[PDB]
Amino acid sequence: SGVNNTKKWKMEFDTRERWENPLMGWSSTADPLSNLVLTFSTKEDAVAFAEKNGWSFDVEERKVPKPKSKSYGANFSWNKRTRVSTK
């Protein structure tokens, strides 16, 4: 339920091929940028960085949970269906 990891913007590269090592069965990657991740304060800064370095980018708007009205009184409702069967 923690929300402290959804505060900053992240820029990351697309996933490429990984294969099984013929000896010892490890995972091998042929691309250098796979583990790279960058942190930006705002969307504009990340977009500016991507344009400056000449990388094509896909940007997605931040999703924030909508305000929800919660009432303790609703559980013990006289006629509405929000009555709880048990607590």
Please identify, among the stretches 38-46, 47-55, 75-83, the one whose residues bind other proteins according to the rule CB under 8 A: 75-83
Q: Are strands 37-40 and 9-12 parallel, antiparallel or unpaired?
A: antiparallel
Q: Does 62 bind other proteins (CB under 8 A)?
A: no
Q: Of 11, 9, 10, which is closest to residue 50 (Cα–Cα)?
A: 11
Cβ neighbours of residue 18 closer than 8 Å, sequence gap 6 or more: 27, 28, 29
Residue 7 Cβ, how far from other proteins at the closest point, in Å? 10
Is the separation of the CB atoms in 9 and 39 below 8 Å? Answer: yes
Q: Does 70 bind other proteins (CB under 8 A)?
A: yes
Q: Does 23 bind other proteins (CB under 8 A)?
A: no
Residues at the site binding other proteins, with contacts judged by CB under 8 A: 1-4, 15, 18-20, 26-27, 63, 65-87
